[PDB]
Design a protein around this ligand. Structure first.
Ligand SMILES: *[C@@H]1O[C@H](CO)[C@@H](O)[C@H](O)[C@H]1NC(C)=O
Ligand SMILES: [Ca+2]
Ligand SMILES: [Ca+2]
Lengths: 196, 82, 83
């Protein structure tokens, strides 16, 4: 079995490990992936947080707080910042090579960041159904990646990610009426072809 | 003019409730407003706006006194025409 | 007002409303604490910690148990689910 890879393709989309694109425009802070899931120790708690990102635009700068080995290293506005260094510094590593910030954290964890929006965490064979979050459980089964925090499969992803917000009193996002044309391309069929 | 529900998070302004009292945070823009049950406006604002902001809550300077500088710019003794 | 104006300066005061015979108004179930955390552990919440290192804020909140659920304090045993 190979090494899986989340992603954040654009402002509001998410590609799970097993492979499931879905739409979730949010504006609160959300658990992208973690290990403290049900009956496990809880080593790492990668999070993600967006501001002004329900409608994609030149707005929507992302913020990412990754919590491994009792640490707090986080990143936004181009650079990476350490708010609390972690104990076993041996595994830590930062490779600012090219357009990316490759960032190792252990034997079986890695993170990639294009300095703008993308978040591609890479995990190894070690876990195999030990994680959960917006990226799912990493089990091979591709249609159980919508198991919410309350331990049930949902069908509508906009109710899924609302289960994974950290602040349980911020605003949960709104069920958008479904359509093939977003706001600007709504009733602008000219522009909708120049984009296609 | 359209009445919205609450909470609400558009345009980088999280309109929440904290401790049973309503809040309007704008940390991107540098302010935190709130109201209580009786009605008591409050505005927490970044040091940033030092020798800067000017309004009905005065300039964020040090001098407690000089902080009646009208919309023209005039130190007035009266706290009312200001 | 005098209570908060001293709190903001870096020196908070405690229990002044015990004998003052005036407590600020709040809805049912809650009354005015002093220096409660903003990250109120509510019912439909995720048990995550040490992200809410924010400063301490005054305002009314629930009793020791009696978790929050939709603007009212309710006992932890009766936490609902959502779907
Ligand atoms: C405030 O700005 C004015 C005009 O630039 C300057 O003359 C003055 O020294 C400043 N005072 C303080 C306290 O920074
Ligand atoms: Ca799965
Ligand atoms: Ca002043």
């Amino acid at each position: 079995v190979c090494d899986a890879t989340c992603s954040t393709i654009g402002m509001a989309h998410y590609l799970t490990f097993d492979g499931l694109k879905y739409l979730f425009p949010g504006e609160c802070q959300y658990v992208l992936v973690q290990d403290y899931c049900g009956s496990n120790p809880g080593t790492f708690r990668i999070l993600v947080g967006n501001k002004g990102c329900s409608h994609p635009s030149v707005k929507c700068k992302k913020r990412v707080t990754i919590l491994v080995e009792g640490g707090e290293i986080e990143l936004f506005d181009g650079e990476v910042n350490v708010k609390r260094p972690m104990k076993d510094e041996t595994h830590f590593e930062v490779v600012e090579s090219g357009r990316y910030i490759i960032l190792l954290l252990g034997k079986a964890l890695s993170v990639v960041w294009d300095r703008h929006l993308s978040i591609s965490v890479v995990l190894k064979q070690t876990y195999q159904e030990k994680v959960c979050g917006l990226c799912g459980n990493f089990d091979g089964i591709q249609n159980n990646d919508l198991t919410s925090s309350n331990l049930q499969v949902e069908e509508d992803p906009v109710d899924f990610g609302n289960s994974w917000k950290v602040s349980s009193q911020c605003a949960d996002t709104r069920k958008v009426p479904l359509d093939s044309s977003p706001a600007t391309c709504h009733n602008n069929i000219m522009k909708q072809t120049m984009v296609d | 003019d359209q009445r919205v529900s609450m909470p609400y998070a558009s345009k980088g302004l999280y309109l929440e409730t904290e401790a049973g009292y309503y809040k309007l945070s704008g940390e991107a823009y540098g302010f935190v407003a709130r109201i209580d049950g009786s009605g008591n406006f409050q505005v927490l604002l970044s040091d940033r706006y030092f020798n800067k902001t000017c309004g009905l809550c005065g300039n964020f300077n040090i001098f407690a006194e000089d902080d009646f500088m009208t919309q023209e710019g005039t130190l007035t003794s009266d706290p009312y025409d200001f | 007002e005098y209570a908060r104006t001293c709190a903001q300066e870096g020196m908070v005061l405690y229990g002044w409303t015990d004998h003052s015979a005036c407590s600020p108004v709040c809805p049912a179930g809650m009354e005015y604490r002093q220096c409660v955390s903003p990250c109120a552990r509510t019912c439909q919440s995720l048990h995550i910690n040490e992200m809410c290192q924010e400063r301490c804020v005054d305002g009314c909140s629930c009793p020791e148990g009696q978790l929050l659920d939709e603007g009212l304090c309710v006992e932890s045993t009766e936490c609902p689910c959502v779907h």
